Amino acid sequence: MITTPLVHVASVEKGRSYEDFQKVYNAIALKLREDDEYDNYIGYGPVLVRLAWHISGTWDKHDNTGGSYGGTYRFKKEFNDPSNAGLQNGFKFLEPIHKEFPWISSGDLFSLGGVTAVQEMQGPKIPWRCGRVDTPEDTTPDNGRLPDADKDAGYVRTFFQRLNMNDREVVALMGAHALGKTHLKNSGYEGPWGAANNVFTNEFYLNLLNEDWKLEKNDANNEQWDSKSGYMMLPTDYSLIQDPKYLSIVKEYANDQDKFFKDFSKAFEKLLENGITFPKDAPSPFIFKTLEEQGL
Numbered sequence: 419m420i421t422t423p424l425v426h427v428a429s430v431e432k433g434r435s436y437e438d439f440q441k442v443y444n445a446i447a448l449k450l451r452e453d454d455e456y457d458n459y460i461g462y463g464p465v466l467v468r469l470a471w472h473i474s475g476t477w478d479k480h481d482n483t484g485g486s487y488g489g490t491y492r493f494k495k496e497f498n499d500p501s502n503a504g505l506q507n508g509f510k511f512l513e514p515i516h517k518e519f520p521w522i523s524s525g526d527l528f529s530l531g532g533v534t535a536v537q538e539m540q541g542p543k544i545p546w547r548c549g550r551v552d553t554p555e556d557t558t559p560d561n562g563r564l565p566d567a568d569k570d571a572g573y574v575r576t577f578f579q580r581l582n583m584n585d586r587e588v589v590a591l592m593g594a595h596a597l598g599k600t601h602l603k604n605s606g607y608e609g610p611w612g613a614a615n616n617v618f619t620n621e622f623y624l625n626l627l628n629e630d631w632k633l634e635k636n637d638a639n640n641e642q643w644d645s646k647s648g649y650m651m652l653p654t655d656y657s658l659i660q661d662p663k664y665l666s667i668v669k670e671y672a673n674d675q676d677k678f679f680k681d682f683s684k685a686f687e688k689l690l691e692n693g694i695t696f697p698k699d700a701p702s703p704f705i706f707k708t709l710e711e712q713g714l
């Protein structure tokens with residue numbers, strides 16, 4: 419039998435519109451503000467961004483398996499992927515919000531969590547479309563589709579071809595490593611990429627270019643790039659300035675945060691929408707207001 423790419427058609431949750439989704443955004447954003455202690459006062463923002471990326475990064479363009487549509491991270495096989503270690507904290511953050519808004523699909527909730535986190539950490543607006551539909555447990559992708567960190571630029575470039583991302587999209591997406599940190603017990607790496615861990619800036623590119631990096635072994639026997647300031651870079655991060663095509667784009671975003679914000683917004687929306695067919699009568703993407711813009 420011929421493997422044709424499955425078609426996943428978006429279906430708006432019955433009788434819901436912009437205001438219903440803005441209500442869910444606000445609930446996420448208010449909990450982000452109130453549960454501020456997590457991970458030594460970094461807050462949940464970074465882990466929600468990582469969650470939105472990991473539920474989307476399983477996509478394979480060749481057969482349209484994986485991706486954010488089906489919300490399959492809720493199932494044990496994907497929940498327990500070693501590559502997803504640490505994301506359970508993001509899932510538990512969202513669980514009460516799902517109980518307050520039971521009508522939203524899992525893929526819509528997980529992807530909206532990442533959009534809300536970016537915007538509430540003062541990043542760019544990210545347009546967002548609803549209509550992901552929960553699919554059954556047999557549609558869960560096998561473990562092993564997410565990328566390894568102990569690799570070089572050629573691996574990064576060919577990995578992201580599977581997600582239909584080009585060099586600029588890859589470099590823009592990687593700027594999310596301004597946020598949060600690596601945790602030895604989750605991934606075998608330890609340390610933050612920069613100082614402003616929970617504000618969305620172009621700091622990742624500035625640190626890449628301006629710090630003095632040294633390759634060192636960490637307590638898990640892996641090698642990572644460390645600077646005297648106490649920052650770290652993964653081998654795949656540092657590959658962005660070893661490769662001359664990636665380096666040109668790193669320099670662009672280090673010098674113009676506005677360009678970075680624009681390109682990141684487009685690439686992050688594309689990541690979250692890969693694999694989904696939106697009907698012709700589907701609503702336009704929503705742009706949610708921040709809590710600040712609402713006076714909340």
Ligand code: HEM
Nearest residue numbers: 464465467468471566567591594597598599600601604605
């Ligand atoms: C080659 C591609 C990538 C690799 C190898 C990679 C690898 C990693 C690893 C090993 C961690 C540490 C996890 C932990 O120890 O808790 C991490 C954290 C993180 N990643 Fe990436 N990542 C990649 C791309 C991305 C993308 C495309 C995004 C989002 C657009 C992203 C967002 C994040 C965030 C926000 C964190 C911090 C999470 C936290 O503080 O809990 N990553 N990444």
